Amino acid sequence: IRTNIVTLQQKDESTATDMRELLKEEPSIDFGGGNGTSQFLTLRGMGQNSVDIKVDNAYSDSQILYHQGRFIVDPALVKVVSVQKGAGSASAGIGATNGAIIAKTVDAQDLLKGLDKNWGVRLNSGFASNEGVSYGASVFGKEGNFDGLFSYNRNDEKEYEAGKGFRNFNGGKTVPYSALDKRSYLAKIGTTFGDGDHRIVLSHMEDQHRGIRTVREEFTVGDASSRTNITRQAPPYRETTQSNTNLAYTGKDLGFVEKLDANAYVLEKKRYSADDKDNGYAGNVVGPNHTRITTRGMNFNFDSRLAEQTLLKYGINYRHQEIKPQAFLNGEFEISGEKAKDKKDMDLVHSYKLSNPTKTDTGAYIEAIHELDGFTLTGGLRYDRFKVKTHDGKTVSSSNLNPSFGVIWQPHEHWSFSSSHNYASRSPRLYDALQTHGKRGIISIADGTKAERARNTEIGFNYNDGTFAANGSYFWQTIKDALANPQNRHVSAAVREAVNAGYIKNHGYELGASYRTGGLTAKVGVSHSKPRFYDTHPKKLLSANPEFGAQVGRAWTASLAYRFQNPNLEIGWRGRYVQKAVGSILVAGQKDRKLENVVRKGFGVNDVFANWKPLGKDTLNVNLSVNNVFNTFYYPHSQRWTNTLPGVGRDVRLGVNYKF
Ligand SMILES: [Fe+3]
């Protein structure tokens, strides 16, 4: 009945092989068009510059390049995915100025669900009309106090075709260079000891998109006239990869500490180009190019019980980030054609000895939870410190004290009410990994620049009597000292700096209602937001790039589904409709290369779907779907407004999964 979370068993009844399709019933997240990292993400209209994907509680905030979205995990690795729309209190961790996607990798215990034994094999296959094929396999089990798992998954997707009316630069229906060969695996071993009180989990996960991909992944190929032509978009072979090595600890009843949760991880993002020759951003490195972002981090979270219903929570977060290119290239630095200035400038850039940019985030927090007779009060405090070192070796540091509090009030067994007022900070992000080389100039940080500081406020209610269900939230957010890294990535300027450049206001709401009577499930959801960026700098420093957000149109979703008892079988309808949207995220208007009058056409997608459980149980699903049944030609709103990447046209899908 809840659209904000999807569980594993739910996903086994589903035919989708990426997050955007998996979460399409949740209205306050929106995805852009295109495949893999073509996709930008928004939460309440706010972009990946602000919203993190945390998997097993490991996450970074750096990007590869402003023309592509931050990597979004492959759902076949996860036992559960949540959207926390809100933020969270003092113990949410580093940078939680907005909500997040939260995901946890799958477990032996999870894969074992269907079965009457301690070991197992899983096989899946999928076929998609528009257009691709997927298969994988998984082995897992538990013995003595150990659990272990190995999973392999591959989704080979061809170029997809848009809905009725869209044409290619060469007259065809498909989206050029939208093919990716997607591979992922997971190795996991865990142990439970200390008379069942202590648990250790060690895991390694790879997730790799490989294919023929444009310079700027957010665009395809337009005709020879447009800035988007075949030699300007210049598609070589590329491999983009997320990796994650995680060590997780969990203790209960450890003296005066009631619960301890700890984790240490390494997180790598790599970009491999076969030939970056015709890619200016990467510096036209001829042949093989490798860019890497490494994130090391550590979290310790403690809970001590102070009275029968009063918990004290305290802990530490440390995160280190390192951008690491193949090689610096500020040597090749060049300005086009007072130009006396240019010359003193090329000179400057050439004499610079560049090094790997780094960012350390440290946090400590304390939080109290007091609960009495259906009324819960949470109050809390964080100290956030950061250190940023740019590729020019310059170091800037700041710290903040962040208070937060909230209440949950439950007067009655069907109803509950919540609100909160949280402060949180986010430290400047490092400039695009792919430009770190310096060819286009030095990217520094001005003296004394501060963390963006967010004030989040919200109220909501929740109602559920086993048959009707309903939920609502209203939220407000101010972000002060919004950071702007230097926005123009074309153009060669000698020294430019990240600064506090203005402030951000956003407000809006979501509603959900549902009805479930033996077999029949009905759901509706609506969500609307209003992110607005204000420049407080003479130079208007803020930008309308999708990484930041977009004014999405009011989004409505709905589904209707019936589960039969004979056979075990569910048929369903699902739709997402988004209304006409008007306006930039920027108050001062956004501009071409001149003032753009932004309007995003509205559109409606319908899907039908089926899930057939032939053995009367969860070990074999045969699923069938038809997505975008009317073959609606449209463009998602979470992306630029000039007609970039369409949403997939009618797609038909059949997937099977089988544990035994
Ligand atoms: Fe560009």
Author numbering: 67 to 403, 421 to 676, 679 to 745
Paper text:
Development of a vaccine against the serogroup B form of the disease has focused on the outer membrane proteins (OMPs), notably the porin protein PorA and, more recently, factor H binding protein. It is also known that other OMPs contribute to protective immunity, including the FrpB iron transporter (also known as FetA), which has been a component of several outer membrane vesicle-based vaccines. FrpB adopts a classical TBDT structure, with a 22-stranded β-barrel and a plug domain at the N-terminus, located within the lumen of the barrel. Sequence variation in FrpB from different meningococcal strains is mainly concentrated into a single region of approximately 40 residues, which is predicted to lie in an exposed location on the outer surface of the bacterium. In addition, we show that FrpB binds Fe3+ with high affinity, and that this binding site is separate from the antigenic region.
The FrpB F3-3 coordinates were then used to solve the structure of the FrpB F5-1 variant, which is a monoclinic crystal form with a monomer in the asymmetric unit. Solution of the FrpB F5-1 monoclinic crystal structure revealed the presence of a peak of high electron density, characteristic of a bound ion, coordinated by residues from the barrel and plug domain. This observation led us to repeat the data collection for an FrpB F5-1 crystal, but presoaking with iron before freezing. Data were then collected at high and low energies, the latter tuned to measure the anomalous diffraction from the bound iron atom. The highest peak in the anomalous difference map, at 11.2σ, coincided with the bound ion. The next highest peak in the map was at 4.5σ, demonstrating that this is a unique and specific binding site. A fifth coordination site is provided by an imidazole molecule, which was present in the crystallization medium. A comparison of the FrpB F5-1 variant structures in the Fe-bound and unbound (apoprotein) states revealed two specific structural changes which apparently occurred on binding of Fe. First, portions of loops 3 and 8 were absent from electron density maps for the apoprotein form, but were structured in the Fe-bound state. In the case of the Fe-bound FrpB structure, however, traceable electron density did not start until Ala67, and residues 67–71 adopt a different conformation.
